[PDB]
From Swiss-Prot:
Quaternary structure, from the entry: Interacts with POU5F1, RBP1, EGR2 and SLC11A2. Interacts with SCNN1A, SCNN1B, SCNN1G, WBP1, WBP2 and ATN1. Interacts with ERBB4, NDFIP1 and NDFIP2. Interacts with ARRDC4. Interacts (via WW domains) with ARRDC1 (via PPxY motifs); ubiquitinates ARRDC1. Interacts (via WW domains) with ARRDC2 and ARRDC3. (Microbial infection) Interacts with adenovirus type 2 PIII.
Regions crossing the membrane: none
Note: A cysteine residue is required for ubiquitin-thioester formation.
GO-annotated molecular function: potassium channel inhibitor activity; RNA polymerase II-specific DNA-binding transcription factor binding; transcription factor binding; transcription regulator inhibitor activity; transmembrane transporter binding; ubiquitin protein ligase activity; ubiquitin-protein transferase activity
PTM note: Autoubiquitinated. Ubiquitinated by the SCF(FBXL15) complex, leading to its degradation by the proteasome.
Keyword Nucleus: yes
Gene that this sequence comes from: WWP2
Alphabetical UniProt keywords: Host-virus interaction, Nucleus, Phosphoprotein, Repeat, Transferase, Ubl conjugation, Ubl conjugation pathway
Chief place of localization: nucleus
Function (record text): E3 ubiquitin-protein ligase which accepts ubiquitin from an E2 ubiquitin-conjugating enzyme in the form of a thioester and then directly transfers the ubiquitin to targeted substrates. Polyubiquitinates POU5F1 by 'Lys-63'-linked conjugation and promotes it to proteasomal degradation; in embryonic stem cells (ESCs) the ubiquitination is proposed to regulate POU5F1 protein level. Ubiquitinates EGR2 and promotes it to proteasomal degradation; in T-cells the ubiquitination inhibits activation-induced cell death.
Listed name of the protein: NEDD4-like E3 ubiquitin-protein ligase WWP2
GO biological process, any: protein K63-linked ubiquitination
């Protein structure tokens, strides 16, 4: 229940208490980056990856190894997304909802590559480096031994979610829910978790929730309040409605961390799209941040991350809306 700041410091300090001296060299070329990094890292002992990193980009004069490290992490974290490797894929249009490719077994040695990716992510977390791989929140759930829920089903598979939501309301459901997330990607996921656990114990993530973990891996960015409010559309509501005015009031009241938490709550990620909120992506294509008048005032506001939509009840007071919004943002998904 402690703040994200506290968990961050505790995790970093925990990493530092288990720090090893000396260093390790990783020699790669920026056009054989994937295979070279793979070979280098997988030919090393896991704990040795806790030593200070010196990425050797063959043919470059730079001596700022921190920047070289960061650039390497970014480049590789993007390189693992190459559809030629059949390691990852997307469940929706416009690179929406990254997931492990069930057909990854088309390459017989794929599990070693997933273990390598685990090691890699573990290295990024250990050395305080950021990645832009774009793992979804349920993925992080799996990393935190949290089971994916029905809401998550709405996040990654809206039609499946609608079907199930109908079946119900007019045990099976639970098996279906688990199956949608775990189908064809069992061994790959376990290999990833093992590779991660080789370098940095999963146990060290025990205090984080999924959004906080995503924040740990992606890094914090300041949110343009202006760009956000400009790209916001409304249903039934107008920008002059009481609830909307109060809403933006609350958002401006928020610090950056809280705004990020809101962004994660409504969109499903802390990452901003290229070109600002105007280029916001949901399932079924481009979809800007929307606010809808849905739900009773006795209910919390709720989100549809597939549509980047915020169901906001017509609360009769600013304080009520503020309370419910903060609570829903911090305690519900």
């Amino acid at each position: 229940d402690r703040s994200f700041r506290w968990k961050y410091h505790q995790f970093r300090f925990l990493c530092h208490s288990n720090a090893l001296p000396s260093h390790v060299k990783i020699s790669v070329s920026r056009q054989t980056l994937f295979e070279d990094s793979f070979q280098q890292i997988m030919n090393m002992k896991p704990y040795d990856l806790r030593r200070r990193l010196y990425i050797i980009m063959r043919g470059e004069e730079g001596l700022d190894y921190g920047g070289i490290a960061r650039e390497w992490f970014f480049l590789l974290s993007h390189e693992v997304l190459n559809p030629m490797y059949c390691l990852f894929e997307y469940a929706g249009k416009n690179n929406y909802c990254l997931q492990i490719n069930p057909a990854s077994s088309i390459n017989p040695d794929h599990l070693t590559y997933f273990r390598f990716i685990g090691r890699f992510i573990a290295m990024a977390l250990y050395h305080g480096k950021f990645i832009d791989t774009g793992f979804t929140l349920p993925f992080y759930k799996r990393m935190l031994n949290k089971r994916p829920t029905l809401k998550d089903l709405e996040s990654i598979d809206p039609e499946f979610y609608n079907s199930i939501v109908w079946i119900k309301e007019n045990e099976y459901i639970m098996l279906l829910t688990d199956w949608r997330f775990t189908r064809g990607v069992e061994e790959q996921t376990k290999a990833f978790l093992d590779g991660f656990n080789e370098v940095a114990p999963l146990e060290w993530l025990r205090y984080f929730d999924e959004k906080e973990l995503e924040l740990m891996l992606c890094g914090m960015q300041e949110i343009d309040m202006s760009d956000w409010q400009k790209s916001t559309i409304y249903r039934h509501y107008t920008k002059n409605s009481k609830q909307i005015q109060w809403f933006w009031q609350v958002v401006k009241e928020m610090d950056n961390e809280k705004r990020i938490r809101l962004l994660q709550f409504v969109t499903g990620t802390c990452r901003l799209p290229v070109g600002g909120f105007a280029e916001l992506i949901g399932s079924n294509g481009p979809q800007k941040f929307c606010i809808d008048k849905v739900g009773k005032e006795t209910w919390l506001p709720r989100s549809h991350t597939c549509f980047n939509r915020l169901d906001l009840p017509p609360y009769k007071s600013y304080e009520q809306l503020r309370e419910k919004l903060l609570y829903a943002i911090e305690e519900t998904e």
